[PDB]
Amino acid sequence: ISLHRYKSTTIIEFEPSGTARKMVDRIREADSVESLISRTTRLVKATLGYDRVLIYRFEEDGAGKVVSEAKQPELESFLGQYFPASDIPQQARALYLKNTLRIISDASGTPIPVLPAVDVSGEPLDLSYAHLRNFSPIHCEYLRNMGVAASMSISVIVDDALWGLIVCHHCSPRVLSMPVRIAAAMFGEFFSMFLQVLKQKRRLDTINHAHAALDRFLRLAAHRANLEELLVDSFQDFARLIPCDGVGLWVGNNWHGHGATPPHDAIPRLARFVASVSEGRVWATHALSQAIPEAEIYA
Amino acid sequence: DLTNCDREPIHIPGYIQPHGCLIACDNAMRMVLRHSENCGELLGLEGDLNGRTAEDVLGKRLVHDLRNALTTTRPAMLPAMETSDGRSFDISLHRYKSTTIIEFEPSGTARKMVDRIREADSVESLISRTTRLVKATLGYDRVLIYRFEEDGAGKVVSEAKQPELESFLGQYFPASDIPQQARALYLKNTLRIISDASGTPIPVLPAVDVSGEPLDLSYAHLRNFSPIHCEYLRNMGVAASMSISVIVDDALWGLIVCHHCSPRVLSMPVRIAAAMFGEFFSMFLQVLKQKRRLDTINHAHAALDRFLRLAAHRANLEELLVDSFQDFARLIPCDGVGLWVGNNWHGHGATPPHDAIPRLARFVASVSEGRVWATHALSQAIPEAEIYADTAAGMLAIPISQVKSDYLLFFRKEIVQNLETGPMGDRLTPRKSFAIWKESVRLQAQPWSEADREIAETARIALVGVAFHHSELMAGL
Amino acid sequence: DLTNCDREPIHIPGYIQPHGCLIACDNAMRMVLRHSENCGELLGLEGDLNGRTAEDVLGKRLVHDLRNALTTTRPAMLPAMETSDGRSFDISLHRYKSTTIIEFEPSGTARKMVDRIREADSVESLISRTTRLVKATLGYDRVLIYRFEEDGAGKVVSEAKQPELESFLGQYFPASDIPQQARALYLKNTLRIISDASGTPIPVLPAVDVSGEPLDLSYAHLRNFSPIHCEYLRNMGVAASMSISVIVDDALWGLIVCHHCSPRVLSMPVRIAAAMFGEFFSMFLQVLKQKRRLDTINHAHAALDRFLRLAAHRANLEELLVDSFQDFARLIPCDGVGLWVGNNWHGHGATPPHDAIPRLARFVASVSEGRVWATHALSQAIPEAEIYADTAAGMLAIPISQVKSDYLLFFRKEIVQNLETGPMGDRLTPRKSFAIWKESVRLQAQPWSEADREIAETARIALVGVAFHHSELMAGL
Ligand SMILES: *C/C=C1/C(=C/C2=NC(=C\c3[nH]c(/C=C4\NC(=O)C(C=C)=C4C)c(C)c3CCC(=O)O)/C(CCC(=O)O)=C2C)NC(=O)[C@H]1C
Ligand SMILES: *C/C=C1/C(=C/C2=NC(=C\c3[nH]c(/C=C4\NC(=O)C(C=C)=C4C)c(C)c3CCC(=O)O)/C(CCC(=O)O)=C2C)NC(=O)[C@H]1C
Ligand SMILES: *C/C=C1/C(=C/C2=NC(=C\c3[nH]c(/C=C4\NC(=O)C(C=C)=C4C)c(C)c3CCC(=O)O)/C(CCC(=O)O)=C2C)NC(=O)[C@H]1C
Ligand SMILES: [Cl-]
Ligand SMILES: [Cl-]
Ligand SMILES: [Cl-]
């Protein structure tokens, strides 16, 4: 029996009837985000027995990326693929901030009406926290089209926000019993915590590395009479500071480029543009043709 | 009024300081719309300037050069400009809300100054040397750095002064002493001068134009300051001042504040050098704060690792915590720390009395919800904590078990333990401000910073994780 | 008497505590020379024991085993020994000044205790956990660690106590409160017990033998303590105590001191475990002090290198010092630092007033002789410094030029700012001791340690060397 209160209605759900610790021991020593997420799909699949287990990470715009996968050999791979923000709608992502573990037992099953659906005073039954809640028929149809009959997902919560989901698919109907769900929720909470710390350590390492690289350049500047020449000789090394595919230097109205940059003759227009919006601050875009229409050609 | 401080509209006083004159023109600079009453005197003109053309008043040569200097709302600085008469002025020119404002002053510093701060390797080293350096360079009798606390209260964090003057170092003043609207202005104009706090101000004619609009002097360096502040200064024996806004991560971190005991103006070239210095000072401070925070987080991560390394060689994690918990005081600045485990308390340093702990622990258990929970005003949460405020007025609580209500508790002492008049009255003195501040922070401790809270959360995860890993050894016990 | 404290001959009181009995024999243990008055009672004997043979009194079996246990003057511990009667005792046996002393008590602890301190990684972590651990293990109402200052004054540096008892933490007491001869005894006997501070002591018969010699009880655990100390304890509400000598680098660093508010004896097995613990505690503390000193010196060397690296990129070493000198506060713990160069002063933190500096600098120039010069009692050197003692009561001066009388000056505040009766009177209370100490250190600061002085000398060489290297650039200026 699962029992809760929400909006002052009581909801009782009935299912006719060291896992977590052992699982968490197998991820606690991960020392990078990639090591954590790679091993987790493999581990969740072995433990819970789902045909496919994915980790789906939210981009900043809400689009999702499949960042890890473990699957039966005959099933297709979704690894490295992205899906639109709309595929997991806004209200779905809000629900998943409340209920951290969700089950669909049978995507082709026949759902069971709540009697009455609307009470005498005009209120529906809010099933936000009910594990027996029936899912959108849009999503259920999405699953059937994939050959998926059942699923389970765990919300991954990092710094109080929805970072992503652990998503399990089965090609035949499947329910997790309450003790198994409890163990898996517990696992998901530790996974979330460890991921959060690993992301934070990665960011620190990244900032520390950048500070040391700046110091190395400044140490060279202190032995050179001509700082401009030094920059012309050295600027490619600034690609180490920030992940990029190209970098260049615009100094004294002359350009020097390295890696993937706009064509040489498109630079003066770009530099005029930068001069007009920078205002002496860092200025950045991921959609350059929205700023400069002519940049579409070298996108 | 002295209570509704943040209401005074200081951007539209209707007056300028006497060390220059001002002309207001339309957007295109064709007609004179307003002028300060002293324009005739300084420019050698007569009668009502308003309604005459810019060219009639200033001549075609000067008006031509001024139009060409226009091209956000950052004032153009034009030294040694001449009127048709031959009189020479330093001219500041800007546009705001589509009115043009022309200010007239009858008339490698920055690089050398910045070289003397660029190698500072700590925030304290930067701020200490800067007051000393600004005083030597600009010659003000007193130079202070005033840092804003998170609630807006100010703290004097560095000082250089004539030996006979009183020290304000380590003192705090209420948020209201530099009102909200003042702090907003200082986000726009980064350098401000008061030439003579006892001088006679000069009206702008007209103060309100025909359509009911005042002249917005937000960006005008000749803007006259609030008479409340000017009276505050006279009570201190201060006749002139200059302040530089310190901007860190796009916000007002504080001020460099210079006081002189006699009247004093900085010429335009000197103001320009000092603004430039202030911008480099701001940038360097920002980087130094960021490096300090990194060092702090890195240190905390290494300390957690050292503890976890010990946990991996111990059969009994609870005993280890009982023996080790005092070392967690290294993670976060505090005056005391303690451990609540298996319904037993162990304390170190300044903590509530032993017998007040179970009430505190019940409280923590009811609000934590398995997260870090912190306050700098413990008596607001638990009325009975007022009695032990002198020892522990702030608390931060870290859950250390996913399953049990065990916690590591950090404490801080109440903050008070780590430390002429004019017609408007004695409110306007540093002594009264400081007393008002002290009264405002009674029963309160220094707030837990964002860094403190980030460290706590990292610690929570470390400790909750190792507890879970040891959970069957401990149930075996 | 309460003034000539160090005269009382506490090694020869002529009395033992009532929780055991004592027999004194000759070197070979053939004859009884002395006995405590309670021997008849505890051993089941009658009359004058002196003159009877060890075998007549104790039986041949026991005397045989005692001879065999003899083999510096560290007492042999023989638990559960039986007399011919069948009465069972824990026996402590030793020889000193060729008298044999037999003490009778009617009758993995250490390893487990030591495991709980062995991983301490700082002096503060070691001492904090030890009071807590000793209290839990041995059950005394209060356990303190009392550390000797260089002048012999004591400081309570750690404490664990019943909640209702008063705290002594952070308090200091005069050197005289643990006299010279007491500290010498505690260098020999490392563990001491007082069972009952209100008990009735037991005379040794005879107290002086026929040839005029007292019985030297230096190594006897039943030795009765000075009535001055026993009265001090009763005034505190303390009925029993135990102390362990803490020996670091062959000297008495301090004491672990346990107080009980009711009578209390530790059995021989418990004393043995606690002595063993104390020896490991001493060893670990010694290593931790040594590591701390190394870390401190290493840190200072790296800070000097950072400054020298800056000097190598600057054309004007004096300007660099004027901008940087506050950073030298990192080298040596201080409350203020300043720079006297070219007959001009620059200060930071708590320093003498600006106008008192030239007198101070003349003084330094006359005693330095090109070496580090330091005092913790500045008014003894310069009478006029008494007035600013609250801000600067100690000074350490580092020459920074081989040729000119330029100095870097470190300062410390006066120490007071960083903080029932029986027939013999109110002198014998912690309140009075603490007040006496406070009075004794007026106008004085915390002494400059050997580490401080080693760092200063290294700094002198660094600064004098870089000054010489820059000397022709600076004369060019
Ligand atoms: C116009 C609406 C659409 C839509 C809505 C929708 N999706 C929901 C849940 C949901 N979608 C996904 C997406 C995927 N799962 C996959 O395995 C893959 C593989 C490529 C994709 C793209 C997930 C993971 C989930 C959550 C699953 C879970 O178990 O929590 C929901 C909410 C369903 C609910 O009742 O909670 C909605 C309303 N999806 C669409 O594609 C469109 C068109
Ligand atoms: C009810 C209103 C009050 C008030 C208003 C006020 N203060 C303003 C400027 C201002 N205040 C300070 C405070 C100090 N300066 C000091 O040196 C000390 C020393 C102890 C204190 C407390 C500063 C630094 C400034 C800014 C100075 C500058 O040059 O920029 C202003 C704005 C003035 C303006 O026209 O810009 C206002 C309206 N001060 C009060 O004390 C109360 C009562
Ligand atoms: C003029 C003589 C005085 C004097 C003499 C004295 N003290 C001795 C032992 C001793 N003193 C202390 C001091 C304290 N213990 C405390 O708990 C506190 C608390 C504030 C204080 C100040 C200690 C720890 C000891 C040693 C205790 C132990 O168990 O070893 C002795 C020697 C006693 C002996 O026979 O060994 C002497 C002679 N104390 C005075 O206060 C003055 C006046
Ligand atoms: Cl990520
Ligand atoms: Cl800061
Ligand atoms: Cl020490």
mmCIF file of N, CA and C and ligand atoms in Angstrom, chain B residues 123 147 253 285 289 292, ligand 5:
data_model
loop_
_atom_site.group_PDB
_atom_site.id
_atom_site.type_symbol
_atom_site.label_atom_id
_atom_site.label_comp_id
_atom_site.label_asym_id
_atom_site.label_seq_id
_atom_site.Cartn_x
_atom_site.Cartn_y
_atom_site.Cartn_z
ATOM 1 N N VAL B 123 42.980 39.655 -1.469
ATOM 2 C CA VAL B 123 42.058 40.762 -1.309
ATOM 3 C C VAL B 123 42.591 41.744 -0.248
ATOM 4 N N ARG B 147 33.000 48.646 2.346
ATOM 5 C CA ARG B 147 32.503 47.443 1.704
ATOM 6 C C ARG B 147 31.067 47.123 2.114
ATOM 7 N N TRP B 253 30.143 46.681 -5.025
ATOM 8 C CA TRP B 253 30.773 45.933 -3.947
ATOM 9 C C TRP B 253 31.022 46.883 -2.796
ATOM 10 N N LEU B 285 40.286 43.278 -7.945
ATOM 11 C CA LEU B 285 39.554 42.798 -6.775
ATOM 12 C C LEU B 285 38.645 41.629 -7.153
ATOM 13 N N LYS B 289 38.944 37.993 -5.523
ATOM 14 C CA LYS B 289 37.829 37.370 -4.818
ATOM 15 C C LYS B 289 37.526 36.004 -5.389
ATOM 16 N N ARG B 292 40.240 33.570 -4.362
ATOM 17 C CA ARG B 292 40.092 33.242 -2.938
ATOM 18 C C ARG B 292 39.007 32.203 -2.713
HETATM 19 CL CL CL D 5 35.165 40.517 -0.274
#
